[PDB]
Amino acid sequence: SLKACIRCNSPAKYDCYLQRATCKREGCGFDYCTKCLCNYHTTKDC
Ligand SMILES: [Zn+2]
Ligand SMILES: [Zn+2]
């Protein structure tokens, strides 16, 4: 059920709650929307 990163397809914690994924890699570890596989809506922007 994990989300495959758009880089090396790593096991990212997929959260259907907000349709977001968090790469579980020490080289990535970033938040992003699993819908558009792009930047996740944050204090900054999407
Ligand atoms: Zn990755
Ligand atoms: Zn989005």
From Swiss-Prot:
- What happens when you mutate residue 20 to A? Decreases UBE2C-mediated ubiquitination
Q: What induces it?
A: Up-regulated at 7 days after osteogenic induction. Down-regulated in late G2 phase or mitosis. Down-regulated in G2 phase after DNA damage in a CDKN1A-dependent manner. Down-regulated in G1 phase when APC-FZR1 complex is active and accumulates at the G1-S transition, coincident with the inactivation of APC-FZR1 complex. At the G1-S transition, transcriptionally induced by the E2F transcription factor.
> Which sites bind Zn(2+) 1?
5, 8, 23, 28
Posttranslational mods: Phosphorylation by CDK2 and subsequently by PLK1 triggers degradation during early mitosis through ubiquitin-mediated proteolysis by the SCF ubiquitin ligase complex containing the F-box protein BTRC. This degradation is necessary for the activation of APC in late mitosis and subsequent mitotic progression. Phosphorylated by RPS6KA2; increases and stabilizes interaction with CDC20.
Q: Which residues bind Zn(2+) 2?
A: 33, 36, 41, 46
The subcellular location is: Nucleus; Cytoplasm; Cytoplasm, Cytoskeleton, Spindle
Task: Describe what happens upon changing residue 3 to A.
Answer: Decreases UBE2C-mediated ubiquitination
* Positions annotated as zinc finger (ZBR-type): 1-46
Subunit text: Part of a SCF (SKP1-cullin-F-box) protein ligase complex. Interacts with BTRC; mediates proteolysis by the SCF ubiquitin ligase complex leading to activation of APC in late mitosis and subsequent mitotic progression. Interacts with FZR1/CDH1 and the N-terminal substrate-binding domain of CDC20; prevents APC activation. Also interacts with EVI5 which blocks its phosphorylation by PLK1 and prevents its subsequent binding to BTRC and degradation.
Function text: Regulator of APC activity during mitotic and meiotic cell cycle. During mitotic cell cycle plays a role as both substrate and inhibitor of APC-FZR1 complex. During G1 phase, plays a role as substrate of APC-FZR1 complex E3 ligase. Then switches as an inhibitor of APC-FZR1 complex during S and G2 leading to cell-cycle commitment.
What is the designated name of this protein? F-box only protein 5
Q: Which organism is it from?
A: Homo sapiens
| Name of the encoding gene | FBXO5
Q: From which residue to which, out of the full length, is covered?
A: 374 to 419 of 447
